[PDB]
């Protein structure tokens, strides 16, 4: 499997209006491949009807729900997590985050014990940043590394960030375990202000720019909540193929 291609395929689904509706739906219980464009749109229709039609719905909510969405961080991370992790059964990322949680210290203590032959993904809920993101840690025999998949509303310490803008280049940048441990563990707390801006910008800013980090918006003394799980790259590949089919067979 070409992992760089999986990411380009997510971008292509995102950029397609019906691909967008499939990817960024908010049904967490059911399999992401079970999503259905006819039902999704029916449910928008009903929703708009309750408010008295599209004109008033826009006046009252401020957006047009038929338009393609740019997902905030929890919407992109939870959905890509399902796309990666689901095989025979649905994965509920809301339930799994609450029941399978480790912190940044336990993540640092344990990543070195993961299997080389296996793929893992961390769903990270960063309570310092008020931000969710994914760390893909695919099987790599030279040196295990992580890839960050994120988007951002831009209401914390970082600027607004669109999922496809991020994925095109920065989501393909590898991040050493050394650096992920520094970001996620208690080590982060001993860093100077400049060191925090450097590390957060390196890992999380599209343009790796220190002045893009508002250090005062990072909550001091907080931690991270992580759900770490193994996944099968074939499932990530085939789920994407299944969603692409929904479009090519429409």
């Amino acid at each position: 499997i070409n992992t760089i291609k999986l990411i380009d395929d997510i971008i292509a689904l995102h950029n397609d209006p019906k691909g967008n509706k499939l990817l960024w739906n908010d049904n967490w219980q059911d399999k992401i491949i079970n999503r259905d464009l006819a039902n999704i749109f029916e449910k928008i229709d009903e929703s708009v009807s309750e408010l008295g039609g599209l004109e008033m719905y826009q006046e009252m909510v401020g957006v047009n729900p038929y338009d393609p969405t740019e997902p905030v961080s929890g919407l992109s991370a939870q959905n890509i997590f399902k796309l990666m992790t689901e095989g025979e059964h649905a994965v509920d990322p809301v339930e799994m985050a609450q029941t399978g949680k480790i912190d940044g210290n336990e993540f640092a203590e344990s990543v070195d014990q993961l299997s080389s032959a296996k793929n893992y993904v961390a769903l990270v809920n960063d309570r310092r940043l008020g931000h969710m993101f994914l760390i893909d840690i695919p099987s790599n025999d030279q040196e295990t590394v992580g890839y960050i998949y994120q988007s951002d509303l831009g209401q914390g310490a970082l600027p607004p960030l669109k999922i496809a803008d991020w994925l095109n280049s920065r989501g393909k940048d590898a991040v050493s375990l050394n650096k992920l441990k520094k970001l996620l563990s208690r080590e982060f707390n001993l860093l100077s202000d400049d060191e925090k801006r450097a590390l957060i910008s390196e890992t999380l800013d599209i343009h790796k720019d220190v002045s893009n980090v508002e250090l005062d918006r990072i909550k001091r003394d907080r931690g991270v909540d992580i759900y770490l799980t193994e996944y099968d790259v074939n499932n990530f590949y085939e789920n994407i193929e299944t969603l692409k089919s929904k479009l090519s067979n429409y």
């Binding site: 957006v63 997902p71 905030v72 961080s73 990322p93 809920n125 509303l153």
Partner: protein, 74 residues
């Protein structure tokens, strides 16, 4: 008081609130169901974006009110 929170997709969840609750509290209740950090939730009660530091009573939110959760970049 039972209120509804409705997303762009038309998904509905029902949340139990008190009039003394801050909008921040309501977002905590949403997070229990949806996963979404409160920092990135935008809740709209019809017409205006709700500020985290004001209360349900402040917004005079009523039984049966629908709040809209917009999970999209501005």
């Amino acid at each position: 008081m039972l209120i509804k929170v409705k997303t762009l997709t038309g998904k509905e969840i029902e949340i139990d609130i008190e009039p003394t609750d801050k909008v921040e509290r309501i977002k905590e209740r949403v997070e229990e169901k949806e996963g979404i950090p409160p920092q990135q939730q935008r809740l709209i009660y019809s017409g205006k974006q709700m500020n985290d530091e004001k209360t349900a009573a402040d917004y005079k939110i009523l039984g049966g009110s629908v709040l809209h959760l917009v999970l999209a970049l501005r």
